[PDB]
Design a protein around this ligand. Sequence first.
Ligand SMILES: O=P(O)(O)OC[C@H]1O[C@](O)(CO)[C@@H](O)[C@@H]1O
Lengths: 280, 315, 413, 162, 325
Amino acid sequence: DKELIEYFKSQMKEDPDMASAVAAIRTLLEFLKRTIQGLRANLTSAIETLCGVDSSVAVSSGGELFLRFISLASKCKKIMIERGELFLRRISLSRNKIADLCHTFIKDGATILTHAYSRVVLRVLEAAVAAKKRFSVYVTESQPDLSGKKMAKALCHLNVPVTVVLDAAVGYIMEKADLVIVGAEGVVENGGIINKIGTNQMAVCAKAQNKPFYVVAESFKFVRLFPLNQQDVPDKFKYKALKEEHPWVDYTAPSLITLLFTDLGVLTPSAVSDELIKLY
Amino acid sequence: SELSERIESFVETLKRGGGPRSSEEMARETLGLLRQIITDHRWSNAGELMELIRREGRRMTAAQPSETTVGNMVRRVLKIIREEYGRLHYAQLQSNIIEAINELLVELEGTMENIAAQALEHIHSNEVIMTIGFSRTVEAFLKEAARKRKFHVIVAECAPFCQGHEMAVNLSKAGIETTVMTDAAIFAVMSRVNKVIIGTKTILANGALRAVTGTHTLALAAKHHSTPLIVCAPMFKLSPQFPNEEDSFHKFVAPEEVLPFTEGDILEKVSVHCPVFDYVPPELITLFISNIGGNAPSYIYRLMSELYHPDDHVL
Amino acid sequence: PPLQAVLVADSFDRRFFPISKDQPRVLLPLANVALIDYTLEFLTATGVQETFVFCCWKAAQIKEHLLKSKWCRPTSLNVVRIITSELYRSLGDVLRDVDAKALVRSDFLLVYGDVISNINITRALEEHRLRRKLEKNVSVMTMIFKESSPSHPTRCHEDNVVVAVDSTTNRVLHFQKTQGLRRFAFPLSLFVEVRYDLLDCHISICSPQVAQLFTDNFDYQTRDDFVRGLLVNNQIHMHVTAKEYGARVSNLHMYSAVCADVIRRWVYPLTPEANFTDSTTQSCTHSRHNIYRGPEVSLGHGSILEENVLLGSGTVIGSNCFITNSVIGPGCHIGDNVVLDQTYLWQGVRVAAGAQIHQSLLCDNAEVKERVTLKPRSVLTSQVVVGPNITLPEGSVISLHPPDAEEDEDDGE
Amino acid sequence: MEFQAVVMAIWYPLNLLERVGFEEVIVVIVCIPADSLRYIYPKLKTDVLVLSCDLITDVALHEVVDLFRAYDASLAMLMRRDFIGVDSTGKRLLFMAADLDEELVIKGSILQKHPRIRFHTGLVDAHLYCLKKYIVDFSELIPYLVRKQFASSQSLDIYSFI
Amino acid sequence: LFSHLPQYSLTQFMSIPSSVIHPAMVRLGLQYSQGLVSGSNARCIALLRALQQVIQDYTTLSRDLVNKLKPYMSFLTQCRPLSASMHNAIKFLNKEITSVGSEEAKSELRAAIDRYVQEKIVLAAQAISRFAYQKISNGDVILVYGCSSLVSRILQEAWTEGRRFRVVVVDSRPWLEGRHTLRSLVHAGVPASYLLIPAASYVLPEVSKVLLGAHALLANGSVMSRVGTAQLALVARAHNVPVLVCCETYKFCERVQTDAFVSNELDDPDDLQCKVALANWQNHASLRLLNLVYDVTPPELVDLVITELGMIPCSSVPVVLRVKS
Ligand SMILES: O=P(O)(O)OC[C@H]1O[C@](O)(CO)[C@@H](O)[C@@H]1O
């Protein structure tokens, strides 16, 4: 109950490249290793405490799928841990599938524009330079955590011309961008995405100039929310935990998104919804 | 005096009811009153004359702030005074203004024939036009194009005052293949409509427009299907007021037009409003067929500078 | 011929008691405007010259207000000629005083001095004159009823007159006030529609014979007596409007109904922002939800005016207040965190803090202290003070006069 | 068999019924033998059209039948001493009085529900009556039932045609 | 023009004890024609009750019942053109009759109407109410339009489950139908406001979300409903307020339509004149009075569809049309 939080923090510690939701799944499944009737009640408390320490959408989404990817099977605890281990085996290969689908969408000599920092966009570009494509990356230093500089330092090792553009200068450099690639922190039920603050005005500018806005999310980031504006995003997700507002996420409408390169194949935004309807 | 009682007769019939039906008669009565004020009050120079006309137009505008055709023709007389005192810079000035006012009046009474003359340039055979309310200028615009070509006008009657009924009968009497519809079907039959020709209550100073209610919905439907929204409106309907949030824009008539008094007890809990004027931003307007041409909305500001002095914008 | 009118500016039912003790019930403000200034303006909208004004009870206030009003200036095309006498005890004395002075020589409008309406008596007047010359003085009156619905706030369930009308000629054949009644008795001699959806509205267009018919039969006192006493004997007809407002302010209930109807623009040429009386101290701006604020009002911080609010000139409002559906009056002080819902506050009030006024009427110069919780239907007459803890009950009148109240000018009696 | 027309106790009603389309006409394919409908009760309990052979001639009774089918009226009457009071629409019966009373007293609740009551005096009763199957349960019951909407053997609603 | 769509102002020819059409079906058709039954859900309930009456009076089955009650639906298409809720109801009924193999099949059929009305018109309404409770927050103001048996149910149960919102009722001539919403709101105690469609752009500045009802959702996501809905949703998007449409699954028609011209019933034009200057409109040869009953809003003007399955983005209504069939 308390060892769960420190074990989740550990699963952050020995690998930061592993996603937050995947860390939640790993600590959740290791909690499942330790009556099995109504065990959803035990795991729901684990989900609530795990979303307490991490405010991200993916932790309360990917953990929700594991609450029901084990509950689609309905002793049964052994088939539960077997199917859960299969679930973990098939989300360790998400970023590779996304990279394989998405690096073919980057033309040679292109000039992409990305946002804050994401292990998926970084992997898309890592696979694109491994396919002997050459391009340049514009990354916005996203306030307040400055993870644009972290991405550009993590992407300069790939020998890519990367430019840490200002957070305000998206509308300036949007015309110098062939395509926009962002990593979603959660994909809501209408096909839009919930991503680090500033993704929305990246999209709104991009559609103002008809630049394709590509999103590279994963399968476990499919959350059941249906926002209609930036109000409808819950305060659980926006606020991470001289007056200042300071959210950390904002909703991007599905009309602004050209394609999603999720784990389960390339989707139009309209193709997201039944991929949530199927999981129900 | 006869003039003074005629001034508050005009002010009272402006607050309370009607009097002049059309805006052309409203502007003609306004010039009649302003010309009478010039002739019959005693003033020495144009200074206190401008002050007198300014305060009379101030009370005529505060009488009914949504009747801007009165407030424009106060400003045109002020511009006329400033430009007929400028060219003498007295004694004969009192004559000169009157002459210019007469040249303004014959500039009126031919505003409709110079808008109707441009009908054939903008209306073609086998087209289809949509109109919202009864406009005297738009009707005469549709009459002049009717005697040469053959078209089909859809008059979306503007509820609650079903005043597109009185236009679709006027158009049907002249053989235009008219069609009156409920005006809940503006977007529905918009897909088959070639042009929208509407009238205004007021053209604001940015090319924005104050029309009968349901026009902004009509304009949005026209912009959706990219149907050109032609606007037939003369230069007394051109007011040098930008869409402030300070002064009141709308006019709100009794809710009996919308929800009748015979509804009973639910009228103590329900807030019924009934505005009569709708704001149309200039980006939904395509043309302003004036009496001097067919110029774009993004020229309307220049028409302000040739009509009203900048000091006379606020009275 | 020119159209005249008789305006009985003293309602002869002791109905607004004790508010009638210190201000006449024709001069008390409806929505920052005295009631007579509605009906007078009504007559000016109709086309009425020579609007005789009959005042008996406290004619000093009424005359000194009329001579400083809009219709006593020579610019107005509605001359008044105030008739002042203490001889009048009822409307019958008023219409009998019309004779022996011959003030009317054609058909005239008899409004009752507290009518509030935007009725246009030209259709009704032309219909009345059409069947006046035609049948040679068969008709003597043409009552004006509004096509209402029987379950309406404006219908007080104290007037609620039912009529029996001949639908082909609009003649009134029966007429009775259904104040206390469950089943309505209609005699069979009148054999013919029977209508209950008629707001009375008191704008009869009685011909001068009516002034004759009040003098010879001295027993009549009021118009209800006249219509009842001549439908047993010379033919009251009627005209029913549907698109125009009309109602008088007989009691304080229908006061609240008509004041809420005026704010919601049901009397459209007579809205508070129209400033139909040309006073400089009653200008308004109809903002968004029938929220009218006068000049120099200085709304506080965080205070919410939801809807149907009228604020007079000089109406500083505190912080985090909540004012709905009410009239606050021309120049008064409202403090912090108050709630003013369906209230009616006249010229000058001290509402201190945190008060919860919910269906009341606060007259002019009435003060209330901190943390006072006036309940519905409470009336605070002029110059009263209510102390810092008086959660006074519903339906309680407080006045400086001791016997005509349920309290006095101190903290909760 | 929606309507089962009943004839009181002559070629005019039977010819009108055959012109409408009726296959059988009971007279109290014609059955041999105003409480006479109670003696013809062992008929099928369909909707009835109680009719009397006197003072009936070539009326478009179909339209009156429509007032039975439009509104699911408990009663539909044909009219062409007793005063009736109809609604503002001119089809809904509200107050059927003969002149037994000295005063036409009206319940106030009718007037609050229906404010405009048009009173017709001495209309000719067309000897045609339309009833549902429950009004026959065990003029007569024609002014009683119009009071019964203010008995319940299924409020009810009763319409008339003039 | 509107030549293919039919203009109507029909019981004079049929015998009073009718044998061509069933008695219940005659009552139903004439109630449709006069206007006693309005609304897609109310028309579907009344149709299914009349069909239960038809089946319980049927005496002999699979082919016979279908080709016997096809003239009934021809009569109903004559009296008032069938909305797609009625169309899918009739399609389900014909599939049910053809599915019944070789007396006792009449009771099993009649309960399948009850198992149709419950879990697709009533239980679906409860599920849509539960889903739309989430999208209704405290303090917001909701613009509804006309009368819908589902929209008003959603508002009433959202109010009685603790929300404190406000409704603006937008209404259109000549049906003046949102009064039936408005009064039904005031009985529930909901604060309300009423105004016509031309004033919609006046109150869309204050409106938080537009909650409409759908008479049919087509196979591309276009929402076929009452004639003011598409225009209202267009002005709603121009004032950037979200548009929610609340539709059950069974109203999903596989017919597809782009413009508001293909399947749009015309009510009689004589409704249009208001108190008159238009009473003599027949004698004016050039003058034609046109009132549509339905129009389609495109799926880009609708932000959300609420359905008993869930909340779907109006571009995945063919998804639901797939998974229910
Ligand atoms: O690293 P991930 O899992 O791709 O997360 C994607 C998004 O989440 C964030 O890292 C935090 O919001 C964002 O910077 C990024 O766009």
